[PDB]
Design a protein around this nucleic acid. Sequence first.
RNA 1: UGAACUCGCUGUGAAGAUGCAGUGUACCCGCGGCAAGACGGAAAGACCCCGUGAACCUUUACUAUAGCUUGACACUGAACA
Length: 148
Amino acid sequence: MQVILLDKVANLGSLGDQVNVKAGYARNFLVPQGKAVPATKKNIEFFEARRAELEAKLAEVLAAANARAEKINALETVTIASKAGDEGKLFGSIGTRDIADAVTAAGVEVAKSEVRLPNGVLRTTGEHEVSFQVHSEVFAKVIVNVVA
RNA sequence: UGAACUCGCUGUGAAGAUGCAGUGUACCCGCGGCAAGACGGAAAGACCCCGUGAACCUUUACUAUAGCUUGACACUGAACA
Ligand SMILES: [Mg+2]
Ligand SMILES: [Mg+2]
Ligand SMILES: [Mg+2]
Ligand SMILES: [Mg+2]
Ligand SMILES: [Mg+2]
């Protein structure tokens, strides 16, 4: 499938680019996720007409919004006193839903799917390093303090 | 249930005769019995054979097929070795 882009995806295409990609990748991933649209002759003519002078600006303001969201909190200890057992060995395993609710209780607007983790379970108490995926380009590393 | 004025023997005869030949006996007709014969009645022999007949059934008969299994392509992607 010949497809014209709207986002800096990693390995296939640059911005404003019409690349030929596998049709499953074009159908299930790009056109739902809002990064690419099918290279109809009308579509590439319409993109050269108006949308190339807007989607770059939208990418710049999205990168700025990711910078704003990542630096409204970087203090790197969010306190959760969830339930635990004695001397390590957390009671019930922590969901990233709960980690999302903790940081949106004190700070950022980051939801569940905007959060990555090495483990994802955080099944003991201590300084567990948490990553973040508010965008595929930029990360953020704000750390958690879980206690009983 | 072809029609009957439907005896016995010996012989002849699709080769085991109430019906032919030869011969012996028997007046016409019931009734109650028996059941040897009328190749008695019943049922186009059920065993056998024939049909370039049928059915089911078996299998290492033939040719197929549902199924189960194999691989290619599609639905079907991204990375990294
Ligand atoms: Mg005789
Ligand atoms: Mg008699
Ligand atoms: Mg009697
Ligand atoms: Mg008879
Ligand atoms: Mg017959």
